[PDB]
Design a protein around this ligand. Structure first.
Ligand SMILES: NC(=O)c1ccc[n+]([C@@H]2O[C@H](COP(=O)([O-])OP(=O)(O)OC[C@H]3O[C@@H](n4cnc5c(N)ncnc54)[C@H](OP(=O)(O)O)[C@@H]3O)[C@@H](O)[C@H]2O)c1
Ligand SMILES: NC(=O)c1ccc[n+]([C@@H]2O[C@H](COP(=O)([O-])OP(=O)(O)OC[C@H]3O[C@@H](n4cnc5c(N)ncnc54)[C@H](OP(=O)(O)O)[C@@H]3O)[C@@H](O)[C@H]2O)c1
Ligand SMILES: [Mg+2]
Ligand SMILES: [Mg+2]
Lengths: 401, 401
């Protein structure tokens, strides 16, 4: 008989190459071994277009309801994408919508294998990116001021008190952006980071540009140093670990020379950019896990990479591709493990451990996708296309579940 | 007799460890060989505090007047710095003020030596960062909305027409930021980049997050692709080079695996962060040149690093330090060379070439500062403190100028 689940996983489907890979993973790696229960939400671009993005909201509310979600990579449309898919509008990122509704910190960690050396010489130990999931430019307002003018931010309190600040006054076409964050969300982000550091017994590094952004970035800096002082200094001391703060340009300079082995806390944008930098340097974009940890008790598992649009275009031309499904597999296994821990179904957790170990063993034994074959030592035995890779994982699972 | 100058250089002095190094460079490397003419502006934190930052404006106007400036690294004060120096207020960055008044693109290039391998394995050729010098969060408005409220951006045109967009409405303390850029400045940035690429025969890479920032970042993207199409596509084709655009997280992922050898165009913030990443990976923060190229014909030479605050603290404790003056020397030599090219005084340009070559030769022969000694192969012969390093350069110049 198959492994049973107590509570369904909330399943958010997606786009392009990852959409292609998603059913292969379920059909070959999960369904033969688990009577998989999920609440399914299709966040493909066409279904979001059809529902005016309502399906994205519905999926986020369902994660709140059940507690644990697993998300496939999605297209965030720009004007090229509006033309390409014939869209009603440039829909907001489904990641931005979901992350805003859950709140939290996205922990991104390289998935390491013995036959790939890091791009960065000194890196000997994993660097985890702790990415603030809330606010900043992921909920922006923007105006194209085609006739220029006085450009301002304006805050009106709930009793009508107005506070204004002028960005610039211009006599020419200009572009304008406004962003926000909240004291409470920044606070939950500091704590999530400090807790993660303690649990993993790693130092925590944080950086902003507080010299330039004196009320905004400096608030992050002050909140972290206050919360650390009042709540974590002694805990950290006791655990043999340290909190380090510096300016953002300095921190990335320092990072190129470190041995790694820390938690790098990052503001939302920085976390996006640097989780890609870190994943790439350690191996590839596919060799990274990503989990949003909400201060409200929710969890969301995902790949850190996107839809692999470029590979999807090759797929559309009838070509086999060698897109690496590792991150998508680890999103499923992370989510299923968490679900089985919360539900008290340890057989589910054990299978997740197995699938993960089998994924590593297969790559380390020399059967891998093209992203890893380019960078492994010694050279790969077989360079498997996406479906061949997944079939070999299913086979090792059938031979064990 | 000493080398003569026709037009003075505008000299902007600065802070902490770089302030210490500045007169050593002039006294030992320049003054014995050049009758150095400069218009001197002290942008030390105390002099800026005294003049309410007026000296910063005066120095910027003088660069406009003469055409070429050379700038020492300066403290941008946050609250720690206000406490530390007893300041009237958290003064705005002097770099932000000067750069705003000149406009342009800051070209940042590693200074390479044969005895230091890059941190990033694949990097075989220099990566140049082309950093937009104007706008974005380097001219921000910010509000700490302690009682929450409706958070907006507002544009009022010169005929009183109001355009509003809501960032968020909140029922809790929040922070608010607004930034701008101009179509014209973005345009001069694209062109400076495309011209630099053509002159240097290197590809140009650019990236933003236009999927998230749909009116702001997407304007940069559209401006670049329009200007390239209408003005550079054929020139680039003819030169054997290519323009590449992608999302910012993807570009840094791609960068960890490239052999280098391109111009990386960067929005202002990205350019700050990544020029540090690139300098560090190639060698150290000191092994990088930086020049602002204004579309109005001005030039400003500087180090890419800051004041080396941490070393200054060691200096204050009576300790010799091994701070690397290379970037400060290259700012002088870059500026003096440009001045002699504009003035028709080739003896000045020849000396700059000499000093630069002697700097490289000394390091490559094994006499270097501690930042390079940590990372060179084979190991250094002597690890020279800052003043000893500079004395050895003067000696080689005395033995040649
Ligand atoms: N939902 C998300 O988490 C998320 C995240 C990022 C992007 N996106 C969306 O994804 C779309 C494409 O974005 P993008 O091309 O910038 O980023 P991407 O999907 O992360 O892929 C960028 C490049 O990295 C390599 N790569 C990424 N994942 C890979 C994998 N699984 N296996 C092998 N190689 C992989 C490929 O490089 P090569 O081409 O050199 O092979 C790929 O073209 C956009 O519409 C964007 O909005 C969504
Ligand atoms: N004017 C500017 O261009 C500019 C630029 C950046 C920063 N700043 C200002 O500089 C102050 C300090 O900023 P920061 O410490 O973040 O950055 P920084 O001055 O660039 O120095 C950061 C670290 O990098 C290494 N480093 C930088 N320059 C070096 C050199 N010349 N020789 C040897 N090592 C060098 C040192 O690392 P180790 O400590 O490990 O030895 C140093 O502590 C702040 O007040 C900031 O506002 C100004
Ligand atoms: Mg990303
Ligand atoms: Mg910098």
């Amino acid at each position: 008989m198959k492994i049973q689940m107590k509570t369904p996983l909330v399943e958010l489907d997606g786009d392009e190459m990852t959409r292609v890979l998603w059913p292969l993973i379920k059909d070959k790696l999960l369904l033969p071994f688990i009577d998989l229960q999920t609440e399914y939400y299709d966040l493909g671009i066409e279904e979001r277009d059809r529902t005016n993005d309502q399906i994205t909201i519905d999926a986020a509310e369902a994660i709140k309801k059940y507690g644990v979600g697993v998300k496939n990579a999605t297209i965030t449309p720009n004007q090229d994408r509006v033309e390409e898919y014939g869209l009603k509008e440039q829909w907001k990122s489904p990641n931005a919508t979901v992350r805003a509704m859950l709140d939290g910190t996205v922990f991104r960690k390289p998935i390491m294998v013995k036959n790939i050396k890091p791009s960065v010489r000194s890196w000997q130990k994993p660097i985890v990116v702790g990415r603030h999931a809330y606010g900043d430019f992921y909920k922006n307002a923007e105006i194209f001021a085609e006739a220029g003018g006085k450009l301002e931010i304006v805050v009106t309190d709930k009793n009508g008190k107005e506070t204004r600040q002028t960005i610039m006054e211009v006599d020419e076409p200009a572009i304008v952006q406004g962003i926000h964050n909240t004291v409470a969300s920044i606070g939950h982000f500091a704590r999530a980071c400090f807790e993660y550091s303690l649990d993993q017994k790693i130092d925590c590094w944080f950086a902003t540009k507080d010299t330039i952004s004196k009320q905004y970035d400096q608030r992050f800096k002050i909140i972290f140093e206050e919360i650390f002082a009042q709540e974590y200094k002694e805990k950290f001391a006791a655990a043999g670990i340290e909190y380090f703060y510096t300016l953002i340009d300095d921190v990335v300079a320092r990072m190129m020379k470190t041995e790694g082995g820390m938690l790098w806390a990052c503001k939302n944008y920085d976390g996006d950019v640097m989780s890609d930098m870190v994943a790439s340097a350690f191996g590839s974009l596919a060799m990274m896990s990503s989990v949003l940890v909400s201060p409200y008790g929710y969890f969301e598992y995902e790949a850190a990479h996107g839809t692999v649009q470029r590979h999807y275009y090759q797929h559309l031309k009838g070509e086999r591709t060698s897109t690496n499904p590792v991150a998508l597999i680890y999103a499923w296994t992370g989510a299923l493990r968490k679900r089985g821990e919360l539900d008290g179904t340890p057989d589910l957790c054990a299978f997740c451990d197995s699938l993960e170990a089998i994924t590593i063993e297969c790559i380390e034994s020399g059967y891998m996708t093209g992203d890893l074959a380019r960078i492994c030592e010694p050279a790969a035995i077989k360079v498997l296309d996406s479906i061949e890779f997944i079939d070999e994982l299913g086979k090792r699972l059938q031979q064990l579940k």
